[PDB]
Write a structure and sequence with these properties.
This is part of a larger assembly, with 1 copy of chain A (139 residues), 1 copy of chain B (122 residues), 1 copy of chain C (180 residues) and 2 copies of chain D. Chain B is α+β, with helices and mostly antiparallel strands and 122 residues long. Chain B has helices at 33-43, 75-81, 84-88, 101-109; strands spanning 2-11, 16-24, 51-58, 65-72. Chain C has a two-stranded antiparallel sheet. Chain D has 3 helices and no strands. Chain D is globular. The chains are: A alpha+beta (139), B alpha+beta (122), C mainly alpha (180), D mainly alpha (70). At the B-C interface, loops of B face loops of C. Chain C binds one RNA strand of 246 nucleotides through helix 5 and helix 6. Chain E: Belongs to the eIF-3 subunit J family. Chain E: It is found in: Cytoplasm. Chain E: This is Eukaryotic translation initiation factor 3 subunit J.
RNA sequence: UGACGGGGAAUCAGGGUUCGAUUCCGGAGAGGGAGCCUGAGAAACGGCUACCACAUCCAAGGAAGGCAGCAGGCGCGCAAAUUACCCACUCCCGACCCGGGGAGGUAGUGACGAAAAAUAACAAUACAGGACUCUUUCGAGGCCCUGUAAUUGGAAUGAGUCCACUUUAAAUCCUUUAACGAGGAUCCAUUGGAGGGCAAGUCUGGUGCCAGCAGCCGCGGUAAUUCCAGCUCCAAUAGCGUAUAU
């Protein structure tokens, strides 16, 4: 049963102000701790420097070795793991290159079949991987 | 080819007549303003270089052209009241070209000196 | 601080469910009948009928002698009888809601050049308008979406500078009429 | 100096390749230059590897787009 | 006489191309031959037309396609 | 507090929710802080006096500083334009019709976005359909219509080159108009897709849990409806795909 009288607007609004914090998107986007632990800091992309190239195996029902890169970001110095998307697009990358790294499409959660990886690479050295991949530009 | 004159105001303060020109020229390009001045001066019993026209916009489709024109009493009232770009379209006037940036540099350099030296610092 | 106006609006609303086969079927039928070019030309007519019906759907919840109803209903029905999609006898506000979307597509200049016999098909009517052939009472119209209200529906002619009008035939025939 | 050269080093092959480039590009405005260079490219790339050939073919491919870009 | 050749005819250009082919193919076993030939092909095709460069690229890629055919089976 | 406030903005059935640095008003500040001169009006910074901080020239005795004005470069960045033209306009200042104004107007870069809208049309012939007054069936008619075929055909026109006008301080762009300008009209429209969600392959070749696609479910271990290619098609269309706030 709710508090439904006529002079009770303060009880209703100071209830719904406090039970909004149990909603997860309101708490995750309005408390402020998510923006300090996120490696981007609220950006759409981030430029960074490839440290080392990795391969990570897929989760249990798939069997593959997904080709990814470890990037160190210029902007705040944190180190991320990003996935270089298309077929044969690992080979276009030298180490110690500027790559422009975007999120994976699920806004902070890291899934696909690849564990603990939520970043993907769009550019390498100001040429994009679609233009490198189709044969429209060169290195 | 055909001049029609829309709304007419004879203006005793600036000594002119004020009207809006309609020009029908259905097989031709936009007619020159000299031919409009000759046709309207043949219409209003006056000489063709006391009358000044401007702002002719040809309508879409090849049709009429519509702009402004004003007919002065004499050339001396024209040399008092008309704008200097519109007299300079007639060869009655010409401006001295520096025009704006060399004047500004000469203005900020004539502040550095004092006395009679402002004339002999250019 | 500039002497400008930035006032603009969008004039179509993209549909919510993008791949429903019944919606694709009916709007492609309207494209193929009325000689439109793409689906945005259908959605724009859906937006203007939706704005008309939103105005009538707002006015119809009032007491019938409130003067906003008695002024703006008369103005809105007068504009719909003026463009011709609501006929002269049935000027009541309940007959706005019985407008189908094919009323405003019949009053375009492309469909009124095809229905007035000035073209051999409707696609010939749009390519005749776009090549500066059709004029409406001495104004040469290059717009295929010109909605002809019925004091201009009477005067639809060929141009005075067109080969199917007065004369001066085009560059194809006059290059062709030089044989030697 | 083109016939007398026998390059084994990297910089020697670069100088040999630059001398061959300067000799070939003098006749670039000939009408028969396109057929002659295509025959020469086909002969010299027959001993090349599949990875080198597909790299060389891609080198022509995006540059043809660069002709459309420029 | 590669440096002394000045071919203007089609047959003279074919003999010049044959002399150039015999000189280049002697260093085919060098490890720097692939980089040198790619640099030479890039320099010589920079002046070529859009139709001409496409025919040169198609001839090498079909040879590349034929090389994948013979090596696999 | 990634908080200037408001008029307002995007969504929206009614309710809400979120955004508002931003062209109008009101406040605040000209690197950080102070303290003042003149003046009707200032705690002025295109005024002065110091301190802090950073910097330029020096004859090392001294001198001068402030782009959060318009342009511009450094730097930080995912992320933002030309060291252009002029007072014609709209107004302001001045002792003033007369001088001044990077206030403003005008051009340039500009797919942030918004409105209009090209990329062919028609007539033949041949083939196939349709309904047929005739026709139990073979078979009809331009005694009637619908589609296709890089199979023909002469009619229309702008993209574009470009005399002029016209616009305008002076040019430009738009509009008007004279001459050129279309066969495959090579004057060649793209971006994502074809298992379900979700409109569209139960096709041909390669790889054989490898490479990879996959927002989710999942496909891949030698008839892959999903990868890599070709053909066909199917949405949207001068645009569409992806990433984050919402």
């Amino acid at each position: 049963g709710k508090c439904r009288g006529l002079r009770t607007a303060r009880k209703l609004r100071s209830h719904r102000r406090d039970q909004k914090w149990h909603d997860k998107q309101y708490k995750k986007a309005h408390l402020g701790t998510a923006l300090k632990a996120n490696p981007f800091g609220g950006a759409s992309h981030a430029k960074g420097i490839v440290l080392e190239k990795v391969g990570v195996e897929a989760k249990q029902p798939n069997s593959a070795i997904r080709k990814c890169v470890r990037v160190q970001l210029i902007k705040n110095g944190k180190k991320i793991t990003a996935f270089v998307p298309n077929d044969g697009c690992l080979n276009f990358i030298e180490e110690n290159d500027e790559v422009l790294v975007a999120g994976f499409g699920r806004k902070g959660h890291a899934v696909g079949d690849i564990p603990g990886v939520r970043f993907k690479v769009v550019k390498v050295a100001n040429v994009s991987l679609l233009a490198l991949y189709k044969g429209k530009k060169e290195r | 080819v055909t001049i029609r004159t829309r709304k007419f105001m004879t203006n005793r303060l600036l000594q002119r007549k004020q009207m809006v020109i309609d020009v029908l020229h259905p097989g031709k390009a936009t007619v020159p303003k000299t031919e409009i001045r000759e046709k309207l001066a043949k219409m209003y019993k006056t000489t063709p270089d006391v009358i000044f026209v401007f702002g002719f916009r040809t309508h879409f489709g090849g049709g009429k052209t519509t702009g402004f024109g004003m007919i002065y009493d004499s050339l001396d009232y024209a040399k008092k009241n008309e704008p200097k770009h519109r007299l300079a379209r007639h060869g009655l006037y010409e401006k001295k070209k520096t025009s704006r940036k060399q004047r500004k540099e000469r203005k900020n350099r004539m502040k550095k000196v004092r006395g009679t030296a402002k004339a002999n610092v250019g | 601080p500039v002497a400008r106006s930035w006032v603009c609006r969008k004039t179509y609303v993209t549909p919510r469910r993008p791949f429903e086969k019944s919606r694709l079927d009916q709007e492609l039928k309207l494209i193929g009948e009325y000689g439109l070019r793409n689906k945005r030309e259908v959605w724009r007519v859906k937006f203007t009928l939706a704005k008309i019906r939103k105005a009538a759907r707002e006015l119809l919840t009032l007491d019938e002698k409130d003067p906003r109803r008695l002024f703006e209903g008369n103005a809105l029905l007068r504009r719909l009888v003026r463009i011709g999609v609501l006929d002269e006898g049935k000027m009541k506000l309940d007959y706005i809601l019985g407008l189908k979307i094919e009323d405003f597509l019949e009053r375009r200049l492309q469909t009124q050049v095809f229905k007035l016999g000035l073209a051999k098909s409707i696609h010939h009517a749009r390519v005749l308008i776009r090549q500066r052939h059709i004029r409406v009472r001495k104004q040469v119209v290059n717009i295929p979406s010109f909605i002809v209200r019925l004091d201009s529906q009477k005067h639809i002619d060929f141009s005075l500078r067109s080969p199917y009008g007065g004369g001066r035939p085009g560059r194809v025939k006059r290059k062709n009429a030089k044989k030697g | 100096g083109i016939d007398a050269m026998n390059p084994s080093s990297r910089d020697d092959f670069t100088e040999f390749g630059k001398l061959l480039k300067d000799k070939i590009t003098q006749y670039e405005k000939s009408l028969y230059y396109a057929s002659f260079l295509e025959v020469l490219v086909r002969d010299v790339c027959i001993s090349l590897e599949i990875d080198d050939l597909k790299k060389i073919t891609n080198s022509l491919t995006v540059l043809c787009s660069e002709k459309q870009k420029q």
